[PDB]
Amino acid sequence: PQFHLWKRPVVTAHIEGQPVEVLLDTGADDSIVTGIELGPHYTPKIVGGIGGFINTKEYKNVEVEVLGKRIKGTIMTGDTPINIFGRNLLTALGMSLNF
Amino acid sequence: PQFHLWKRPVVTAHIEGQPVEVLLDTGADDSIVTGIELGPHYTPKIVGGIGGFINTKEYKNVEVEVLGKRIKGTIMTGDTPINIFGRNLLTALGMSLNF
């Protein structure tokens, strides 16, 4: 199936049972989410974007249900203005950019 | 043809004859380039990203050759750390995100 990019490529995902709207982003290396609580077992990180950088919390082997499939992967949480699924999860969902 | 996303989706483009490496990004609304000079006929803009926002110069109807095709479109220039082609040009190149 595919996304024709006249609108933002947005889907609903469940992270450890919690539902979240996410943007599927090929220019992101990694994924970052806000407004979800995931535990004390994290490593501190900083990710850089366009306007500067932010502090994040990296969680490994998190359970994610999206597009009729359940995968486990790395998620960061931090003060992002929008939630992003980056290339790390898009490869796990078998997505490609086609032309 | 397609890009499998284990590596960054990067191509070379010619903007008004000048060659530039660009990242094809589905989470960008628009495109922004640096290190190219495009004229005094621009409108001032500010784009926001992850770490904050930047000042840009918006140029309309610019000539772009990429993936064996020549298209005209809107490009901004500013102090981006990487050059991005956003959804505005990816639709004009007939790209979709497939799964």
Binding site: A28, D29, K45, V47, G48, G49 | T80, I84
Partner: peptide, 4 residues
């Protein structure tokens, strides 16, 4: 664009 997002990176670590």
């Amino acid at each position: 664009f997002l990176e670590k």
